[PDB]
Amino acid sequence: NVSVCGLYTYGKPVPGHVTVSICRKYSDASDCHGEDSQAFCEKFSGQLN
Amino acid sequence: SNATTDEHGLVQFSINTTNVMGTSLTVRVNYKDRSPCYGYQWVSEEHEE
Ligand SMILES: *[C@@H]1O[C@H](CO)[C@@H](O[C@@H]2O[C@H](CO)[C@@H](O[C@@H]3O[C@H](CO[C@H]4O[C@H](CO)[C@@H](O)[C@H](O)[C@@H]4O)[C@@H](O)[C@H](O)[C@@H]3O)[C@H](O)[C@H]2NC(C)=O)[C@H](O)[C@H]1NC(C)=O
Ligand SMILES: *[C@@H]1O[C@H](CO)[C@@H](O[C@@H]2O[C@H](CO)[C@@H](O)[C@H](O)[C@H]2NC(C)=O)[C@H](O)[C@H]1NC(C)=O
Ligand SMILES: *[C@@H]1O[C@H](CO)[C@@H](O)[C@H](O)[C@H]1NC(C)=O
Numbered sequence: 001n002v003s004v005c006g007l008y009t010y011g012k013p014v015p016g017h018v019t020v021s022i023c024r025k026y027s028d029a030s031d032c033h034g035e036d037s038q039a040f041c042e043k044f045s046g047q048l049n
Numbered sequence: 050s051n052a053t054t055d056e057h058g059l060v061q062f063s064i065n066t067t068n069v070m071g072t073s074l075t076v077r078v079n080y081k082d083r084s085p086c087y088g089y090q091w092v093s094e095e096h097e098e
Contacts, residue, residue, distance in 0.1 A: 027091070029089045029090050029091055030086065030090055030091075030092070032085065032086040032087075032089055032090060033085035033086055034085065034086040034090065
């Protein structure tokens with residue numbers, strides 16, 4: 001389970017088109033002038049109520 | 050001495066004989082080494098000489 005909100009004063013929320021992601025990876029020895037060091041990703045989309 | 054690959058990727062040549070006894074001859078080509086990402090990394094383009 002994972003969730004994301006948005007407030008500012010007196011907890012009054014604001015509506016918006018959120019675009020959250022959850023990229024994940026293994027070890028970090030492929031970045032020594034080597035592109036795509038950051039492994040495969042995951043993404044989502046939707047509107048805030 | 051450099052040269053360029055003729056049709057069917059190939060190069061013939063000769064050299065002068067005036068030394069000691071055992072003569073070592075190596076031939077390098079496109080990308081003489083693997084300097085970017087080496088020593089620390091775990092996967093690379095190990096091309097033969
Ligand atoms: C592969 O090896 C080649 C030879 O080592 C490299 O090619 C270049 O070849 C020239 C000529 O052999 C060398 O000399 C230069 O020449 C120019 C122009 O001079 C010309 O005119 C005189 C007239 O008397 C003639 O006798 C010459 O032979 C020339 O045809 C000069 O303006 C330069 O200052 C220079 O002296 C180059 O030095 C040589 N290049 C290198 C890097 O040694 C070829 O570049 C090599 N391949 C790679 C990828 O590096
Ligand atoms: C959080 O995720 C779980 C599923 O992984 C949802 O379901 C609950 O699962 C547990 C299992 O032990 C039950 O005890 C709960 O009763 C289940 N929930 C309900 C509403 O009955 C859970 O609902 C998720 N919570 C949110 C806020 O999305
Ligand atoms: C190449 O071999 C010839 C043989 O006639 C010799 O005269 C010349 O000095 C040699 N040159 C080099 C650079 O080895």
